[PDB]
Amino acid sequence: ADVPVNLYRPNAPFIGKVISNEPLVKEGGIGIVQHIKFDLTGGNLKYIEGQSIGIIPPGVDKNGKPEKLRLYSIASTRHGDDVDDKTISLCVRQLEYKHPESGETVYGVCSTYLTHIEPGSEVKITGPVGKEMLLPDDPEANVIMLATGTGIAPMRTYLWRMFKDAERAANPEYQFKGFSWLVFGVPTTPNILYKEELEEIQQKYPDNFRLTYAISREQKNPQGGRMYIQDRVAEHADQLWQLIKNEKTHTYICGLRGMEEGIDAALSAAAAKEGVTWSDYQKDLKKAGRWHVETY
Ligand SMILES: Cc1cc2nc3c(=O)[nH]c(=O)nc-3n(C[C@H](O)[C@H](O)[C@H](O)COP(=O)(O)OP(=O)(O)OC[C@H]3O[C@@H](n4cnc5c(N)ncnc54)[C@H](O)[C@@H]3O)c2cc1C
Ligand SMILES: NC(=O)c1ccc[n+]([C@@H]2O[C@H](COP(=O)([O-])OP(=O)(O)OC[C@H]3O[C@H](n4cnc5c(N)ncnc54)[C@H](OP(=O)(O)O)[C@@H]3O)[C@@H](O)[C@H]2O)c1
């Protein structure tokens, strides 16, 4: 052990308490993505970067059976947002879809519950879960973050642990010296979750953190379509591949499914110029624990 896993399971979950539920999507954006913080005092839920936790929503489904957990990537570092080892945070988007056929807009159960949760409320938290999105202990490692929407959550945990002054002071063991690159694909600028903090990290650390955005409603790719994270990985395909070649580099992909086939096609052309088949180099990176994916 070292990596915490399942200190709380579904049968007897941690009764956490909401401290804050703040909006991430600013005025003019598409959606509601909230940053919810939960009090962890009273128990022993310790968690690490890249992990997730479950939230069991209240109520029953359409069949009468209780609602089962929904996994959410932790948006905070092990220390929490206030760097006190007392809280855990999440970056939750309210699932919403206008009809598979009929009855109009539908709202996701756990996501709506969470995006509208009030401070002081008790929540059923399980977790931590996941050994697939962990950050290397090596401060000199390079890390490529490929995020879309709520997949910004685990990237935030790496970036804050690496770049927040208080996190640095709390971690003498991890004083990040490498290069991290976030390619974040959101539909509008107000939809850039944690824009202020992401940008102020890139300002303090120009040579250590590069920030690339693919904003769908304000940018077009070289083919005239809307700008997606794949288009962005495509225009920087060579550089991205030149970094992937390093033994210390780690790549993280997170967000809803669908972005993986474009990131691959792009990194394939890059890699093919030097004689290597990306998919086979990738297979080896996964076995090596250096190519991390979590799409949902
Ligand atoms: C490891 C992991 C990490 C995750 N991290 C996050 C995170 O950080 N943030 C986050 O917001 N979510 C995250 N999720 C997703 C989250 O677990 C829930 O799946 C999501 O919040 C929706 O659950 P819900 O309770 O709102 O909806 P439910 O009520 O369970 O929704 C039920 C159904 O809605 C559906 N559906 C979704 N979109 C459509 C559509 N467009 N058209 C038709 N049907 C549709 C599917 O049929 C699904 O079965 C993560 C999932 C996993 C596995
Ligand atoms: N209206 C409400 O009050 C309410 C509440 C909650 C949520 N909504 C949900 O909130 C969400 C926004 O959250 P966010 O800030 O986390 O951003 P986001 O939606 O995660 O960003 C991801 C991207 O997926 C799209 N994507 C589309 N086509 C694609 C393709 N070919 N390849 C790859 N990706 C594609 C979207 O583009 P385009 O859409 O531009 O094509 C979008 O920019 C919305 O999707 C919304 O439906 C509504």
Strand pairing class (291-295; 52-56): unpaired
Active site residue 73: yes
Residue nearest to atom 40 of ligand 1 (CA): 97
CA-CA distance, 211 to 156, in Å (whole number)? 12
Nearest partner of 81 among 13, 164, 152, judged by Cα: 164
Q: Is 60 annotated as a binding residue?
A: no
Q: Resolution in A for the shown PDB structure?
A: 2.2
Domain 1-129 fold: Elongation Factor Tu (Ef-tu); domain 3 (2.40.30)
For the chain, where do the domains classified as CATH 2.40.30.10 start and end?
1-129
- Cα–Cα dist 254/50, whole Å: 10
- Which ligand 2 atom is at minimum distance from the Cα of 225? 31
Q: Could you tell me which residues come within 8 angstroms of residue 24 by beta carbon, excluding any fewer than 6 positions away?
A: 33, 34, 35, 91, 193, 194
Active site residue 254: yes
CATH topology for 130-295 is Rossmann fold (3.40.50)
Question: Which of 70, 76, 104 to probe ligand 1 with, by most ligand atoms within 8 A of CB?
Answer: 70
CA distance 56 to 19: 18
- According to CATH, where is 3.40.50.80 located in the chain? 130-295
In 3D, which of 274, 279, 265 has the Cα closest to residue 237? Answer: 265
Site residues for ligand 2, CB cut-off 6 Å = 25, 30-33, 93-94, 96, 148-150, 185-187, 191, 193, 216-217, 226, 228, 258-259
